[PDB]
């Protein structure tokens, strides 16, 4: 089991196409926002407690029931059908605010075409005030109210926050980003025109880039001075920030965003072209390789954060303290800006980031394009053109508030209220349904007869008490402690919390809506109604 060769071969054949923004972009930002080091242990314990069991359960359901992400509940719970609509709303919100990162990255890619790097050019090229280009080439100490050139670039070109005084007053629309998101939507529309991808060819050509570019970025960050301060801060247990800090919510959000469960994507990817093919192992190796890639990304971010903090002679956890999604772009710009072939590496990294984000967002709409096929196979299954275009237009019209000058004022709100309580409560509802409403012993018998090997005893005790209690505790800690958002020199008002709670409620209130709508259809007393509705209908 150690250095036998088969394990390293299986990991080498899996590290190529097992990386998403949930572990290269979402993990470093969350880990650095709540303090590095003090997040790794809660993240990994919450993972090993309630991320692998739910992943395996969703995979087993998708492989056994052979139904979509919504039609699978017809055989599980006729009442718990609104969870499909909740998953659809969550995926719509994601595709609304997740494509803005791709828009920014593609604008960076377009701007990187010039032989001269605009990152190291804040000498009033277009307009930039109060910037310091030379870090150590001038032998001048860092002054008060000084920002990095890459920070000024990200704050004044791709996301013009100076036009909007705050979230209450959003500016106009940026045409340079509107055309970018339009091109991105045109590209994503020409890739889901068929909807079949299980043995494609593009997967290899998009997986061959990370295995090399991540390694070259890692060695570049390793051969960079001052990185010793960042590595020590990344491996700090920091037990003081674990007792009663309530950081487990962000850990669970990162886990459910990087692994896949909670968004209705494992069911779609499991209910096709697979039945009894090496179960109980593929999920584990996928989780392991995802955690490994996440740790590699965190390390390659922190080894550059260490240099950025050493070149300023200030604390590591203070350089980017009021920064949201700006942590990744500024870090990558400052890391690539110190390389011989900086422009080529920059354009290659931006292109691979674009194709990785595209391959990641291909899975978001995949679970919603096939959800209506297994639910309405008589009206939507014959068109295949009047539904994908409709959902693309709806996403374009729903992703316009995140394209204004106050971009980060909306992305930061949807980064902790659209997937924080929503995905968590959806996973909790699904787990408690599969546990109590359907029966643990029944599902155990099904997986035993479809696999030939009953799961371990540790897995049976998980889905009954481990995951539901932990998710309930996380939800209670979130409700009894409203977060405090704070961008660069900005504080969110009191109505922002109400807006976030309303956003995190519309994606969940549909389940009680369907619950109240289901009982008023069938006649009879309440007891007979629940008795006849709990039991699934004939397949």
């Amino acid at each position: 089991r150690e250095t036998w060769g088969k394990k390293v071969d299986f990991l080498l054949s899996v590290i190529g196409y097992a990386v998403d923004l949930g572990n290269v972009w979402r993990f470093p930002y969350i880990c650095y926002q709540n303090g590095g080091g003090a997040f790794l242990l809660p993240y990994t314990i919450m993972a090993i407690f309630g991320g692998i069991p739910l992943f395996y359960m969703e995979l087993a359901l998708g492989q056994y029931h052979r139904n979509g992400c919504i039609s699978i509940w017809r055989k599980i719970c006729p009442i718990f059908k609104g969870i499909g609509y909740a998953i659809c709303i969550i995926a719509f919100y994601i595709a609304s605010y997740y494509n803005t990162i791709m828009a920014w990255a593609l604008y960076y890619l377009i701007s990187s075409f010039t032989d001269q790097l605009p990152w190291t050019s804040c000498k009033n090229s277009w307009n930039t005030g109060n910037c310091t280009n030379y870090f150590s080439e001038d032998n001048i100490t860092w002054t008060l109210h000084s920002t990095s050139p890459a920070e000024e670039f990200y704050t004044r070109h791709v996301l013009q926050i100076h036009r909007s005084k705050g979230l209450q007053d959003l500016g106009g629309i940026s045409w340079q980003l509107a055309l970018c998101i339009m091109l991105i939507f045109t590209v994503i529309y020409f890739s889901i025109w068929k909807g079949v991808k299980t043995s494609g060819k593009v997967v290899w050509v998009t997986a061959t880039f990370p295995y090399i570019i991540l390694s070259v970025l890692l060695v570049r960050g390793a051969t960079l001075p001052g990185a010793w301060r960042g590595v020590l801060f990344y491996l700090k247990p920091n037990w003081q920030k674990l007792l009663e800090t309530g950081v487990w919510i962000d850990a669970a959000a990162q886990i459910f965003f990087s692994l896949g469960p909670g968004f209705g994507v494992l069911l779609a990817f499991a209910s096709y072209n697979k039945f009894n093919n090496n179960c109980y192992q593929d999920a584990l190796v996928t989780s392991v390789v995802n955690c490994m890639t996440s740790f590699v990304s965190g390390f390659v971010i922190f080894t550059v954060l260490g240099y950025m903090a050493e070149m300023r002679n200030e604390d590591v956890s203070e350089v980017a303290k009021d920064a949201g999604p700006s942590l990744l772009f500024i870090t990558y710009a400052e890391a690539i800006a110190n390389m011989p072939a900086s422009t080529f590496f920059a354009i290659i990294f931006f292109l691979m980031l674009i194709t990785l984000g595209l391959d990641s967002t291909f899975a978001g709409l995949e679970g919603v394009i096939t959800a209506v096929l297994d639910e309405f196979p008589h009206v939507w299954a014959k068109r295949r053109e009047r539904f994908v275009l409709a959902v693309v237009i709806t996403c374009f019209f729903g992703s316009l508030v995140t394209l204004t000058f106050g971009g980060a004022y909306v992305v930061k709100l949807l980064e902790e209220y659209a997937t924080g309580p929503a995905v968590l409560t959806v996973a909790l509802i699904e787990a408690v349904a599969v546990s109590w409403f359907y029966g643990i012993t029944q599902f155990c018998r099904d997986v035993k007869e479809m696999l030939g090997f009953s799961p371990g005893w540790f897995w049976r005790i998980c889905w009954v008490a481990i995951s539901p209690l932990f998710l309930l505790f996380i939800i209670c800690s979130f409700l009894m402690s409203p977060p405090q958002l704070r961008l660069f020199q900005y504080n969110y008002p009191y109505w922002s919390i109400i807006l976030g709670y309303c956003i995190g409620t519309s994606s969940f209130i549909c389940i009680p809506t369907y619950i109240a709508y289901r009982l008023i259809i069938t006649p009879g007393t309440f007891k007979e109604r629940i008795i006849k509705s709990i039991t699934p209908e004939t397949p």
């Epitope: 000498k123 009033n124 109060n130 910037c131």
Partner: antibody
Framework: QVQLQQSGPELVKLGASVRISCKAS????????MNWVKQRPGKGLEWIGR????????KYSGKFKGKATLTADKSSSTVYMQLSSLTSEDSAVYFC??????????????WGQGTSVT | DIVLTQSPASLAVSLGQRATISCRAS??????????LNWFQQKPGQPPKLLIY???NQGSGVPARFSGSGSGTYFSLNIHPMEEDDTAVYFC?????????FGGGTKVEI
């Protein structure tokens, strides 16, 4: 206060070359632009080019792309402009318009006395 | 090379009167909300000093007698409390991209 001095009067020589010294003091030298405008006697004004101290960028208008060069020097905090092929109508004065610190984009009054050539 | 020429050519000096100067920038549009335009003042035998920058703010060491407004293409200048001591020539400069070029200029004389 930011001091700014220039060279003295010179003579126009056909086909020869001249150098105009312009040293800044009392401000961040290699952090802002350094324009070079031309003021004909009695006539209007015109732009020649700009250079950032530090060999970063070197732009021009289009009518003096080859007849006027720009050279920076971060050591002595001076900026030179070596002319070439002086003509009869080029007899005018030149200033050192220090550009603003970015977003504003103006000249913060630091205009030299001007070097006249005849 | 975005050319920019002023429409007026010469005005008259009068105590307490309105006089505006316009700048033709039809082939120009605001870039990042800040009007990349400047206003200078050149007296006979004196280097031009800053008068008004960004067409909205007041220059360094300039009295409140001068004030400018406008956005986009047309820009004006309010010099209502004008006296004999302001008998200089004013220009117009735009700073959008690499197109820095001055204007024709306007003089005042009674």
């Amino acid at each position: 206060q930011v001091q700014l001095q220039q060279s003295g009067p010179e003579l126009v020589k056909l086909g020869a070359s001249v150098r105009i010294s312009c040293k800044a003091s009392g401000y961040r030298f290699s952090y802002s632009w350094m324009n070079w405008v031309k003021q004909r006697p009695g006539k209007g004004l015109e732009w020649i080019g700009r250079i950032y101290p530090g060999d970063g960028d070197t732009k021009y208008s289009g009518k003096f792309k080859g007849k006027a060069t720009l050279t920076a020097d971060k050591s002595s905090s001076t900026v030179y402009m070596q002319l070439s092929s002086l003509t009869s109508e080029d007899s005018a004065v030149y200033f050192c318009a220090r550009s603003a610190y970015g977003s504003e984009g103006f000249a913060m009054d630091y205009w030299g006395q001007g070097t006249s050539v005849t | 090379d975005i050319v920019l020429t002023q429409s007026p050519a010469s005005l008259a000096v009068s105590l307490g009167q309105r006089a505006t100067i316009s700048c033709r920038a039809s082939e120009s549009v605001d870039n990042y909300g800040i009007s990349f335009l400047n206003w200078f003042q050149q007296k006979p035998g004196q280097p031009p000093k800053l008068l008004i920058y960004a067409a909205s703010n007041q220059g360094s060491g300039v009295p409140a007698r001068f004030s400018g407004s406008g956005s986009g293409t047309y820009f004006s200048l309010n010099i209502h409390p004008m006296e004999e001591d302001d008998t200089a020539v004013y220009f117009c400069q735009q700073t959008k991209g690499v197109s820095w070029t001055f204007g024709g200029g306007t003089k005042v004389e009674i």
